[PDB]
Structures are given as C-alpha cells and as structure tokens.
C-alpha cells in the first residue's frame, strides 16, 4: 500500500520496487527460520511420531520451494526489468540483492547447485563492492557499502566456512569506516556498524552467533 | 527420484515469468504493472508455502494438545500468511482494474480477468461461509468472462494455451471449491475433445500439449477411483 500509492503517483522508485522484491524472499525465509527453531526446540524435548515428523518435513519443503520461487522470480525481474533503467546506486543495490538471493538459495540447496549458488553470491558481492567504491563518496561509511560488506561477511563466515577471514573482513571495514569519520554518520550507518561490531563480538568468542545481516 | 519435481517447479518458474512478461509487455504504454505481477507471484508463493499446513490441518490440530507451542507458531504463520493473500490479492485486482483498458490486445485483457479469477479462488480458500461463497461466485464470473473473450478473439481458441489455462483453473474451482468433481471432469473432457477436434496433423504449442496432458491426467485419476 505504501509502495502502491507512491508508484501510482523512475530512480528511487526502482529502489522502492527493489525493496519490495527483497521483502518477498526475506519474509518467507524469516517464517521458515521461526519454524526450524521451534522444530529444534520441540525435537530436543520430544520423540513425536513418524506421521507428525513427516508433516513437519512437508511444511519445511513447502517453505523452501516458495523461497526458491521468489528468489528466482526476483533475480530475473532485476536482470530483465530493473537493471537497464538503474543508475549506478540502484544498480549496486540490486547487485547486492542478487548476492543475498544466491545466498538464500545456497542455504536451501545441496550438492553442486549449492556450490554454484555460493560462487555467484561471491561474484555479486565482489562486483557490488567494487561498483560502490568507484562512485560513492566517503564509501567506507556509506550505508549501502557497509550493508554489502556485512552480508558478504555472513557469506564468508557460514557458507564459505571461513570464520577467521569473515571477522577480519568485518573488522577492517569497521576500522576504515571509523578512519573516515571527519568528514555525524547517518542513522543507517551507525546501525550497520553496530551489527558489524556485535557480530564480531560473538565471533571473537568462538561462536557463530546470530549472524545478523543488513536490514535492507 | 523425481526428475519430474525439478521439471514441475521449473514450470512454476516459467509461469511467474509469463505473468510478469504479459502484464508488463502487453500494455500500450509500467512500474505499477510490474508490481501487480510481482504481487500476484508473491501471493502464489505465500499460498504454496501453506499447502501442507492446509492439507494436514486435522493431523496438526491433533498434535496441539501435546505439542501446543509448536502448533501455535504454525497457526500464527497461517493466519498472517492468509491475511497477506487476502490484502495483497485485493491490491493486485485494484491495479488490474485501473489499467485493464490500457491493454488494447484482447488476449491480454482476458489474461488479467482470468488472473482476477485465480485471486478470487485464493480468497475463497481462506474465507468462510457467505464471504467464501461470494468469492466463488466472483471467480465464476471472471472465468466465464475470460473464456468468452478467448472464444471471441483468439485464433483457434479450443487449442489455445491461454484458453486451456483458463479452462484448467475453472475446472479446479469446480472440482475443489464448488464441490462438483464430476461436473469438473465433464467440463475438462469437453475441452479436451474440443481441442483435439481442432487441427491436419498440425502440431499444437508445447504449452497446449502440457495443459492437455494435465487435463487428461486429472480426468483419468477421477475416472479410476
């Protein structure tokens, strides 16, 4: 409704559209995360029965299907419908989003498909950051840059299985952000820096933690 | 060992693509139309994620006595996801209605009206009693309107893939929501024979042959049991 009334009345409109596309995938992904925590808790305490266990597996598979469907739709909308009309900023936003989506597909898939997805997410995150560095003034502390960094860091820590490198990556981004400070930072920048520092805090202690990603 | 499975959701993927292509490339003039398509696809995905929650509802309610908290989380997600299908499908419908006329192509107008038929069918799966019956009635209207437009405007309509996709969704409404599986199968049979009596030994489109297969498979499963 918010997005509808705005569109009914193209630059940050594309950004607005792209934020709604992100939300298609992350909304269903968040609900599945809730189901799995609940499942983990349930099964920690209880044996259940074979029928119930199957229903739960069925439900998870329904949610994963839907995440894969949304991800696939959105990647293609970004390539076919958004990218040729985007300015460098929206374009970078969209390339980051494609990395997020390749990452969410890799959380779900196995075998060679999983690996193909993690590789493409590396490719997009790397390409988004390079683009960001070339046009963003004061890129080290820009929130689009820090959110791309943050999300790449979660790819590095988990899917790529390099906790130490992920933490090094985050810490060097925090440092570079702080070295740029003068030249107050935006609310979004401070929010992202706190997530970076909070993730690092957990990782320093030998724990994956929440692996909090960017709120956009 | 379902290589049919990877083929099935690849068809679901092709379907989403086609919704957005049509809404977005059939117009005579948009970001709003992209959003309408994007939302149709979202709503289909929200519905898809709930299918086992729905078809196993009695098993799930049964488990709530001894497994309260888990089943409550499931119930809460279902309520929220269904609120979303209801609210966002009305969003898509409003967008379609405000822009319907800006599709000069007769096929594209029928496409949008079938789509409203689908979205009404979705609301009908969620809603209860009369509110449900009114959505079923509105879905009937939309399907019959789209079918009539397809009959009027489409070349060799009985074997046209949009025509057959419309038959199939109306058949689904008849089978499930209308509680008339026999009426549904006669309806499907009728359209199979009408399509076949179209065409030399001419080849139909791949999407026609896919839809005729689905229609045939469904009648036979009903005929055998």
Author numbering:
A (entry chain A): 46 to 54, 60 to 233, 236 to 268
B (entry chain B): 30 to 58, 62 to 231, 233 to 258
Authors' own words:
One protein family common to humans, C. parvum and in fact all eukaryotes is the group of tyrosine 3-monooxygenase/tryptophan 5-monooxygenase activation proteins (YWHA), also known as 14-3-3 proteins. The dimer is shaped like the letter “W” from one angle, with an un-partitioned bicameral pocket where a substrate protein is held at two typically phosphorylated sites in the two component clefts. The parasite Cryptosporidium parvum has three 14-3-3 proteins: Cp14ε, Cp14a and Cp14b, with only Cp14ε similar to human 14-3-3 proteins in sequence, peptide-binding properties and structure.
While Cp14ε conformably binds a number of known 14-3-3 ligands and Cp14a attracts none, the third C. parvum 14-3-3 protein in our study stands out by interacting with a peptide that is a phosphorylated copy of the last six amino acids in its own C-terminus: LLT(pS)AFF – a motif hitherto not known to be relevant in the context of 14-3-3 proteins. Protomer 1 follows the standard 14-3-3 architecture, albeit with the helix αB1 atypically disordered (and hence not visible in the crystallographic structure). This serine, which was found to be phosphorylated in the crystal structure despite the fact that the protein was expressed in E. coli, interacts with the Arg79-Arg153-Arg154 triad just as the mode 1 peptide does in Cp14ε, with the backbone of Cp14b's tail tightly aligned with the peptide RAI(pS)LP and fitting in the binding groove in a very similar way. In contrast, the other subunit of Cp14b, namely protomer 2, has a disordered C-terminus in our crystallographic structure; however, this polypeptide displays its own unique feature. Specifically, the helices αA2 and αB2 appear as one continuous helix, behaving like a bent spring given room to relax and straighten. In its new position, αAB2 blocks access to the binding groove and potentially contributes to inhibition of Cp14b's ability to bind another protein, as seen in Figs. 5D and 5E from two different angles. With protomer 2 adopting a conformation with only 8 helices, Cp14b can no longer form a dimer in the same way as other 14-3-3 proteins, which rely on helices A and B configured as a bent spring. The novel dimer, held together by hydrophobic interaction, does not form a merged and undivided substrate cradle. Instead, the two binding grooves face opposite directions and are separated by helices αC1, αD1, αAB2, αC2 and αD2. The division and twisting of this cavity makes it impossible for the chaperone to hold a substrate in the standard way and potentially forms a third mode of inhibition for Cp14b.
